[PDB]
Amino acid sequence: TIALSEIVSVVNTSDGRLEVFGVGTDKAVWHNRQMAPHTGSPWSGWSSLKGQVTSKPVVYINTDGRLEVFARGTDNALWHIWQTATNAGWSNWQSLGGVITSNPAIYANTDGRLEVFARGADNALWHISQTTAHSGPWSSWASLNGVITSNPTVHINSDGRLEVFARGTDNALWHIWQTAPDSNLWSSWESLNGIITSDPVVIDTADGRLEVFARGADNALWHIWQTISHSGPWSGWQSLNGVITSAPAVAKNCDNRLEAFARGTDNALWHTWQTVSHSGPWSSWQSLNGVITSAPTAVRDADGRLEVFARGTDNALWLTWQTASSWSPWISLGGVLIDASAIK
Amino acid sequence: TIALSEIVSVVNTSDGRLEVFGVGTDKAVWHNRQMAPHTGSPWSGWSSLKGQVTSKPVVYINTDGRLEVFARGTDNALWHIWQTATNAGWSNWQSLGGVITSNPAIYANTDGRLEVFARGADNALWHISQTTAHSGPWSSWASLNGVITSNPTVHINSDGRLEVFARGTDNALWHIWQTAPDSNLWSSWESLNGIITSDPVVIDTADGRLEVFARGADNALWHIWQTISHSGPWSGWQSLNGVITSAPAVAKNCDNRLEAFARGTDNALWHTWQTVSHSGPWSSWQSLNGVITSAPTAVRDADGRLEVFARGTDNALWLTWQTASSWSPWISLGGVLIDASAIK
Ligand SMILES: CC(=O)N[C@@H]1[C@@H](O)[C@H](O[C@@H]2O[C@H](CO)[C@H](O)[C@H](O)[C@H]2O[C@@H]2O[C@@H](C)[C@@H](O)[C@@H](O)[C@@H]2O)[C@@H](CO)O[C@H]1O
Ligand SMILES: CC(=O)N[C@@H]1[C@@H](O)[C@H](O[C@@H]2O[C@H](CO)[C@H](O)[C@H](O)[C@H]2O[C@@H]2O[C@@H](C)[C@@H](O)[C@@H](O)[C@@H]2O)[C@@H](CO)O[C@H]1O
Ligand SMILES: CC(=O)N[C@@H]1[C@@H](O)[C@H](O[C@@H]2O[C@H](CO)[C@H](O)[C@H](O)[C@H]2O[C@@H]2O[C@@H](C)[C@@H](O)[C@@H](O)[C@@H]2O)[C@@H](CO)O[C@H]1O
Ligand SMILES: CC(=O)N[C@@H]1[C@@H](O)[C@H](O[C@@H]2O[C@H](CO)[C@H](O)[C@H](O)[C@H]2O[C@@H]2O[C@@H](C)[C@@H](O)[C@@H](O)[C@@H]2O)[C@@H](CO)O[C@H]1O
Ligand SMILES: CC(=O)N[C@@H]1[C@@H](O)[C@H](O[C@@H]2O[C@H](CO)[C@H](O)[C@H](O)[C@H]2O[C@@H]2O[C@@H](C)[C@@H](O)[C@@H](O)[C@@H]2O)[C@@H](CO)O[C@H]1O
Ligand SMILES: CC(=O)N[C@@H]1[C@@H](O)[C@H](O[C@@H]2O[C@H](CO)[C@H](O)[C@H](O)[C@H]2O[C@@H]2O[C@@H](C)[C@@H](O)[C@@H](O)[C@@H]2O)[C@@H](CO)O[C@H]1O
Ligand code: NA
Ligand code: NA
């Protein structure tokens, strides 16, 4: 078991527009797009990419600007679908094979090859990559071993090395990393201790450090971080308090101040943020209202403003964004979304 | 002849710190570094990377976070020097051969291979690239032909294709582009007309469009841009007025509003900026004071604030940055810098 997942995958397109991806009642992937690269842009309305999926669908942008979506299929293999040219039409769904037991997780190597991570049937971490920059065909699968109990998350260190985080068998945060950029050589798994009750979330700070956020045993928001740029060792676990009922989401303001979001016990959206600068201390928690039925999803738009998505009481996706004064009122983007997360 | 050049090359390191590179009286490359990734950080003071150079030295950051500096040597070959690991020590200077007659210009392909452009002895555009991501050895040289009369500038389109701009024999802005990302296949040269009297400057907008700035025949600041994301055709040339005595410099605010900087006729620093948003109209010109003896160099720091560098009356580098209210007073970073630009 883990805290309630995010309901969509969001990305900033090559032309600065937000685009969201989720799963409908029919089990198809659906997406909604800003028309314009500005806060409060009108949206396309939902449109189907078809397929039948049994995980959260996860969008990542290739280094040539083409979006690509990954999802577990009905046969448990990894499936994907991609734009044929940047912000143009999409391929058919195509299988990358294997058998997976988590949502896929994706990052670009420094050489432009996408690399995908997901839990296997043996509960270990497996991975597969593009054989050349932003293109098929793909390598064969291999395992990075471990035994994990949450969806994995990947990021890149400030020196190019990929690094994966997941909950272990003891409910601690564990991790593993490339020993060189683009490499097929990885470290051993290592533990960062704690006890966590959500999927870990990872982000890179302005100063080139991986920082991880997760829900603890007391249902407060905890985090932990690399102490120096791309370098071990890590800090201790520190709490950011609150009581939260969903997974957390994290984004950088336009000044690189980190801001965390989560569903509270009153089932409203709550957030806490670094004050002053990106090395500053965190605010106390404060409410953005709404009643919501998924973890929030946060992203920075092309006006440098944070925008947050969450499923509503009507199962539609709803949206609120930063203004000069405070935040916008909640507005509805329609649709009816389900949580297809492979691990719940 | 062209407007007075920028005196330094600036970059944002992998850990969010500004770092500047210039040329001293001895013809060595010297650099100065922020200690901390914040506006108003103290600086290292100047420190020598040695070498003897006969162009402006140009720093670019590899996709593994390692800085690499390019400069024409005393034998007219292209020379370079690189960090052996991210923000660690530097290699020795090493020659990439050839004979060049401009400052080098650099960009990363979507596959992580750096590619360098520079004018040849035949006055054509030549280029050379890393054979693999963020690493030597390098390809052999080849020409993209043309005949050009300014330092070239390269950027990347929002679909991964590199594109180079330079002044032609008729003093118009001309350009050429990859037909596919990472490719060795390029278009023919094409003209964007106008008459320009500075090196062209190029930047990508929040909405994935290349936008070019240059000084015109009337010594006003002009610009021109792609009309749709990564797509021809371009707009017409439009003027931003002012009277300017150096090359322009351009940077994005943390909200992606573009901001242009130049030396005025009173030899102070002047700037004009998009108002409201990144699709908004440009302000009237306004003074940041100082008396300065080089074009300004502008960059956004890790607090999302613009910082501007320019050589002073004492030949030292001076620095002013955005605040809440207005801008900081000019402060001195010491040193004695010369303009080693291969084209003046
Ligand atoms: C290159 C090519 O033709 N690929 C085929 C896929 O397009 C096929 O997948 C399915 O496509 C149809 C429309 O033609 C529709 O989108 C289906 O929902 C989709 O199949 C489902 O969704 C996938 C993601 C998997 O879960 C699959 O097992 C589901 O049946 C498949 C045939 O299904 O074959 C490819 O060759
Ligand atoms: C630095 C170091 O050696 N750390 C040890 C880890 O490598 C160990 O993890 C396990 O390693 C073996 C290979 O020797 C294999 O990969 C296991 O699957 C892996 O352990 C599992 O996965 C972890 C993420 C946890 O969930 C763990 O509870 C699983 O048993 C561990 C094993 O005790 O010790 C480290 O000190
Ligand atoms: C554009 C517009 O008029 N939007 C209205 C929303 O602001 C309303 O949402 C609700 O706002 C109140 C405070 O004014 C409070 O934040 C509520 O919790 C919130 O509504 C709930 O949360 C939403 C995210 C959904 O789950 C919704 O079903 C809940 O009722 C809505 C009221 O639905 O009206 C809009 O017109
Ligand atoms: C791998 C290796 O040993 N490379 C040699 C370079 O380091 C040499 O260059 C020069 O290095 C010395 C210190 O040893 C000092 O920095 C000199 O200023 C520098 O040479 C000058 O600057 C270069 C950029 C060129 O302009 C060069 O022609 C100048 O003489 C050179 C020998 O000069 O050989 C390499 O093999
Ligand atoms: C679309 C198209 O065909 N445009 C023409 C350009 O390709 C031409 O430029 C020249 O092309 C030849 C190869 O056929 C060669 O590369 C020349 O060096 C190049 O012209 C020179 O470089 C330019 C940047 C200008 O400086 C020009 O004045 C030089 O003579 C031109 C040539 O007239 O016409 C375009 O229509
Ligand atoms: C930290 C501090 O006290 N800085 C002082 C600077 O603000 C001073 O610079 C000058 O400021 C005035 C307005 O107050 C005006 O902007 C001048 O044009 C500017 O000084 C000139 O421009 C500089 C960039 C240099 O070229 C300098 O040689 C010129 O005199 C300076 C005065 O030198 O004092 C600092 O202490
Ligand atoms: Na990730
Ligand atoms: Na450039």
PDB file of N, CA and C in Angstrom, chain B residues 38-84:
ATOM      1  N   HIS B  38      23.597  32.416  -6.070  1.00  0.00           N
ATOM      2  CA  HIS B  38      22.671  33.480  -5.665  1.00  0.00           C
ATOM      3  C   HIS B  38      23.146  34.825  -6.190  1.00  0.00           C
ATOM      4  N   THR B  39      22.196  35.713  -6.417  1.00  0.00           N
ATOM      5  CA  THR B  39      22.500  37.069  -6.834  1.00  0.00           C
ATOM      6  C   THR B  39      23.291  37.786  -5.740  1.00  0.00           C
ATOM      7  N   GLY B  40      24.377  38.458  -6.128  1.00  0.00           N
ATOM      8  CA  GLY B  40      25.234  39.169  -5.174  1.00  0.00           C
ATOM      9  C   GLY B  40      26.201  38.279  -4.400  1.00  0.00           C
ATOM     10  N   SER B  41      26.394  37.033  -4.862  1.00  0.00           N
ATOM     11  CA  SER B  41      27.417  36.141  -4.330  1.00  0.00           C
ATOM     12  C   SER B  41      28.759  36.805  -4.469  1.00  0.00           C
ATOM     13  N   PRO B  42      29.657  36.533  -3.509  1.00  0.00           N
ATOM     14  CA  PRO B  42      31.041  36.930  -3.707  1.00  0.00           C
ATOM     15  C   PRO B  42      31.662  36.095  -4.827  1.00  0.00           C
ATOM     16  N   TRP B  43      32.715  36.635  -5.412  1.00  0.00           N
ATOM     17  CA  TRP B  43      33.378  36.038  -6.560  1.00  0.00           C
ATOM     18  C   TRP B  43      34.750  35.558  -6.178  1.00  0.00           C
ATOM     19  N   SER B  44      35.268  34.607  -6.957  1.00  0.00           N
ATOM     20  CA  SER B  44      36.578  34.009  -6.734  1.00  0.00           C
ATOM     21  C   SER B  44      37.704  35.031  -6.858  1.00  0.00           C
ATOM     22  N   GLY B  45      37.510  36.038  -7.713  1.00  0.00           N
ATOM     23  CA  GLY B  45      38.634  36.783  -8.237  1.00  0.00           C
ATOM     24  C   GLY B  45      39.195  36.017  -9.438  1.00  0.00           C
ATOM     25  N   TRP B  46      39.892  36.748 -10.287  1.00  0.00           N
ATOM     26  CA  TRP B  46      40.411  36.199 -11.537  1.00  0.00           C
ATOM     27  C   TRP B  46      41.486  35.157 -11.315  1.00  0.00           C
ATOM     28  N   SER B  47      41.463  34.145 -12.167  1.00  0.00           N
ATOM     29  CA  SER B  47      42.359  33.018 -12.106  1.00  0.00           C
ATOM     30  C   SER B  47      42.634  32.530 -13.533  1.00  0.00           C
ATOM     31  N   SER B  48      43.877  32.163 -13.826  1.00  0.00           N
ATOM     32  CA  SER B  48      44.313  31.956 -15.195  1.00  0.00           C
ATOM     33  C   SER B  48      44.189  30.506 -15.630  1.00  0.00           C
ATOM     34  N   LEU B  49      43.668  30.327 -16.837  1.00  0.00           N
ATOM     35  CA  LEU B  49      43.650  29.025 -17.486  1.00  0.00           C
ATOM     36  C   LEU B  49      44.781  28.933 -18.488  1.00  0.00           C
ATOM     37  N   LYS B  50      45.643  29.954 -18.491  1.00  0.00           N
ATOM     38  CA  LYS B  50      46.836  29.999 -19.323  1.00  0.00           C
ATOM     39  C   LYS B  50      46.442  29.982 -20.804  1.00  0.00           C
ATOM     40  N   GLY B  51      47.242  29.368 -21.668  1.00  0.00           N
ATOM     41  CA  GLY B  51      47.054  29.469 -23.091  1.00  0.00           C
ATOM     42  C   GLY B  51      47.446  30.834 -23.619  1.00  0.00           C
ATOM     43  N   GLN B  52      47.491  30.931 -24.943  1.00  0.00           N
ATOM     44  CA  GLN B  52      47.668  32.195 -25.651  1.00  0.00           C
ATOM     45  C   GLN B  52      46.629  32.167 -26.742  1.00  0.00           C
ATOM     46  N   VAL B  53      45.736  33.134 -26.761  1.00  0.00           N
ATOM     47  CA  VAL B  53      44.590  33.043 -27.652  1.00  0.00           C
ATOM     48  C   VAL B  53      44.526  34.277 -28.533  1.00  0.00           C
ATOM     49  N   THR B  54      43.909  34.117 -29.695  1.00  0.00           N
ATOM     50  CA  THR B  54      43.762  35.185 -30.683  1.00  0.00           C
ATOM     51  C   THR B  54      42.304  35.302 -31.118  1.00  0.00           C
ATOM     52  N   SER B  55      41.379  34.876 -30.237  1.00  0.00           N
ATOM     53  CA  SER B  55      39.952  35.128 -30.382  1.00  0.00           C
ATOM     54  C   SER B  55      39.357  35.310 -29.022  1.00  0.00           C
ATOM     55  N   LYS B  56      38.101  35.709 -28.996  1.00  0.00           N
ATOM     56  CA  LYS B  56      37.334  35.660 -27.773  1.00  0.00           C
ATOM     57  C   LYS B  56      37.290  34.170 -27.382  1.00  0.00           C
ATOM     58  N   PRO B  57      37.473  33.856 -26.091  1.00  0.00           N
ATOM     59  CA  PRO B  57      37.325  32.504 -25.602  1.00  0.00           C
ATOM     60  C   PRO B  57      35.840  32.271 -25.314  1.00  0.00           C
ATOM     61  N   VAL B  58      35.315  31.105 -25.683  1.00  0.00           N
ATOM     62  CA  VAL B  58      33.875  30.843 -25.608  1.00  0.00           C
ATOM     63  C   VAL B  58      33.669  29.549 -24.815  1.00  0.00           C
ATOM     64  N   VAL B  59      32.953  29.669 -23.706  1.00  0.00           N
ATOM     65  CA  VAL B  59      32.660  28.539 -22.820  1.00  0.00           C
ATOM     66  C   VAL B  59      31.295  27.943 -23.184  1.00  0.00           C
ATOM     67  N   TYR B  60      31.217  26.618 -23.194  1.00  0.00           N
ATOM     68  CA  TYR B  60      29.969  25.905 -23.366  1.00  0.00           C
ATOM     69  C   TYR B  60      29.951  24.746 -22.394  1.00  0.00           C
ATOM     70  N   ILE B  61      28.770  24.361 -21.944  1.00  0.00           N
ATOM     71  CA  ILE B  61      28.678  23.288 -20.945  1.00  0.00           C
ATOM     72  C   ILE B  61      28.236  21.999 -21.623  1.00  0.00           C
ATOM     73  N   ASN B  62      29.056  20.964 -21.522  1.00  0.00           N
ATOM     74  CA  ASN B  62      28.693  19.639 -22.045  1.00  0.00           C
ATOM     75  C   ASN B  62      27.416  19.105 -21.344  1.00  0.00           C
ATOM     76  N   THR B  63      26.793  18.092 -21.935  1.00  0.00           N
ATOM     77  CA  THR B  63      25.552  17.575 -21.376  1.00  0.00           C
ATOM     78  C   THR B  63      25.789  16.719 -20.118  1.00  0.00           C
ATOM     79  N   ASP B  64      27.045  16.419 -19.800  1.00  0.00           N
ATOM     80  CA  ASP B  64      27.408  15.843 -18.527  1.00  0.00           C
ATOM     81  C   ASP B  64      27.841  16.899 -17.502  1.00  0.00           C
ATOM     82  N   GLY B  65      27.511  18.167 -17.732  1.00  0.00           N
ATOM     83  CA  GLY B  65      27.840  19.274 -16.811  1.00  0.00           C
ATOM     84  C   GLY B  65      29.266  19.839 -16.824  1.00  0.00           C
ATOM     85  N   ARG B  66      30.161  19.295 -17.657  1.00  0.00           N
ATOM     86  CA  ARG B  66      31.547  19.734 -17.742  1.00  0.00           C
ATOM     87  C   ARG B  66      31.687  20.915 -18.698  1.00  0.00           C
ATOM     88  N   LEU B  67      32.324  21.974 -18.206  1.00  0.00           N
ATOM     89  CA  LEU B  67      32.644  23.144 -19.003  1.00  0.00           C
ATOM     90  C   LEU B  67      33.782  22.860 -19.932  1.00  0.00           C
ATOM     91  N   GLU B  68      33.732  23.564 -21.040  1.00  0.00           N
ATOM     92  CA  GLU B  68      34.717  23.398 -22.102  1.00  0.00           C
ATOM     93  C   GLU B  68      34.820  24.759 -22.779  1.00  0.00           C
ATOM     94  N   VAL B  69      36.047  25.217 -22.980  1.00  0.00           N
ATOM     95  CA  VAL B  69      36.300  26.531 -23.544  1.00  0.00           C
ATOM     96  C   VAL B  69      37.008  26.391 -24.858  1.00  0.00           C
ATOM     97  N   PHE B  70      36.570  27.169 -25.834  1.00  0.00           N
ATOM     98  CA  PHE B  70      37.115  27.134 -27.192  1.00  0.00           C
ATOM     99  C   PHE B  70      37.690  28.493 -27.552  1.00  0.00           C
ATOM    100  N   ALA B  71      38.839  28.484 -28.210  1.00  0.00           N
ATOM    101  CA  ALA B  71      39.481  29.722 -28.643  1.00  0.00           C
ATOM    102  C   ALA B  71      40.459  29.480 -29.780  1.00  0.00           C
ATOM    103  N   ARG B  72      40.551  30.447 -30.701  1.00  0.00           N
ATOM    104  CA  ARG B  72      41.604  30.394 -31.728  1.00  0.00           C
ATOM    105  C   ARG B  72      42.962  30.586 -31.023  1.00  0.00           C
ATOM    106  N   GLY B  73      43.919  29.730 -31.367  1.00  0.00           N
ATOM    107  CA  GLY B  73      45.289  29.834 -30.880  1.00  0.00           C
ATOM    108  C   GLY B  73      46.180  30.746 -31.717  1.00  0.00           C
ATOM    109  N   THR B  74      47.465  30.773 -31.340  1.00  0.00           N
ATOM    110  CA  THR B  74      48.451  31.659 -31.953  1.00  0.00           C
ATOM    111  C   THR B  74      48.819  31.160 -33.322  1.00  0.00           C
ATOM    112  N   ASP B  75      48.658  29.862 -33.554  1.00  0.00           N
ATOM    113  CA  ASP B  75      48.829  29.269 -34.888  1.00  0.00           C
ATOM    114  C   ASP B  75      47.529  29.307 -35.768  1.00  0.00           C
ATOM    115  N   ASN B  76      46.503  30.044 -35.347  1.00  0.00           N
ATOM    116  CA  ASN B  76      45.157  30.058 -35.977  1.00  0.00           C
ATOM    117  C   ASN B  76      44.287  28.787 -35.982  1.00  0.00           C
ATOM    118  N   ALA B  77      44.767  27.721 -35.359  1.00  0.00           N
ATOM    119  CA  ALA B  77      43.990  26.506 -35.200  1.00  0.00           C
ATOM    120  C   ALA B  77      42.962  26.709 -34.097  1.00  0.00           C
ATOM    121  N   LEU B  78      41.977  25.812 -34.058  1.00  0.00           N
ATOM    122  CA  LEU B  78      40.984  25.837 -32.994  1.00  0.00           C
ATOM    123  C   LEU B  78      41.609  25.084 -31.848  1.00  0.00           C
ATOM    124  N   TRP B  79      41.566  25.685 -30.668  1.00  0.00           N
ATOM    125  CA  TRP B  79      42.064  25.044 -29.451  1.00  0.00           C
ATOM    126  C   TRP B  79      40.945  24.967 -28.439  1.00  0.00           C
ATOM    127  N   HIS B  80      41.067  24.006 -27.530  1.00  0.00           N
ATOM    128  CA  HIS B  80      40.094  23.859 -26.464  1.00  0.00           C
ATOM    129  C   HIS B  80      40.704  23.311 -25.202  1.00  0.00           C
ATOM    130  N   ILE B  81      39.970  23.495 -24.122  1.00  0.00           N
ATOM    131  CA  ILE B  81      40.363  23.044 -22.804  1.00  0.00           C
ATOM    132  C   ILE B  81      39.063  22.708 -22.054  1.00  0.00           C
ATOM    133  N   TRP B  82      39.082  21.654 -21.237  1.00  0.00           N
ATOM    134  CA  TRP B  82      37.872  21.158 -20.610  1.00  0.00           C
ATOM    135  C   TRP B  82      38.083  20.718 -19.175  1.00  0.00           C
ATOM    136  N   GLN B  83      37.017  20.780 -18.408  1.00  0.00           N
ATOM    137  CA  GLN B  83      36.964  20.159 -17.098  1.00  0.00           C
ATOM    138  C   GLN B  83      37.014  18.630 -17.237  1.00  0.00           C
ATOM    139  N   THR B  84      37.796  17.967 -16.398  1.00  0.00           N
ATOM    140  CA  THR B  84      37.936  16.484 -16.445  1.00  0.00           C
ATOM    141  C   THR B  84      36.771  15.784 -15.741  1.00  0.00           C
TER     142      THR B  84
END
